[PDB]
Amino acid sequence: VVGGTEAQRNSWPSQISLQYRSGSSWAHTCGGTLIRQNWVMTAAHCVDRELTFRVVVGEHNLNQNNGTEQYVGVQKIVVHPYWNTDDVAAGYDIALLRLAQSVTLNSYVQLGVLPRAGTILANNSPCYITGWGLTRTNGQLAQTLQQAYLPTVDYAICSSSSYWGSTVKNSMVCAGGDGVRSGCQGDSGGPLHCLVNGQYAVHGVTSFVSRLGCNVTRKPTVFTRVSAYISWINNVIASN
Ligand SMILES: [Ca+2]
Description:
Elements: E1 5-6, E2 15-22, E3 25-36, E4 39-42, E5 53-57, E6 70-79, E7 95-99, E8 127-131, E9 146-149, E10 152-153, H1 155-158, E11 172-175, E12 191-196, E13 199-208, E14 221-225, H2 230-238
Antiparallel strand pairs: 1-9, 2-3, 2-5, 3-4, 4-7, 5-6, 6-7, 8-9, 8-12, 10-11, 11-14, 12-13, 13-14
Bound molecules: calcium ion.
């Protein structure tokens, strides 16, 4: 997250760190949202590589013991069947990870609330992106979870010529674009939390940013629209 502020430890308890084994160690690669005690919603592109993954819930500082972490293997990965790694702009950048064990819920580990199917937010709706991704374009990962206020940019504006044009689809949510705050590499897969009827819900799964850089004016961060996938999500959970 570029131009973020450090999140309070108990702010975003559905945020997870998706990590892959790297030698004798584990490296953060993407975010995710805990949606059941044994399921995590993330981006499909986060799990294209044939790597060994684990999920960390209750995480705050990647590099220090917080006293609140639970570590769990990924047992099954279900990518959306229409995802095509060659074509992020086509959409479908979403995957569900079934965890090897159910995690324990507490102040630091909670299920992410999802929107009702089909819900579209009005332009400029209040949302926060959270994650441990790069804090600058071509920078380094955050040590502590970051949040940035990123108001939505509705489809009509987001798919206009000076914004994303044809690259953005109605199956996506755009947010931000102010040239200062943005998602960045390593936030992919994580939540965009939007306030609706008094309650934050996870409306987006971070998907992509401009090839030109993370915080680019009129190139808001782009998220898979969760509310476009509620049936798919329910179907996968029910059959696994
Ligand atoms: Ca930690």
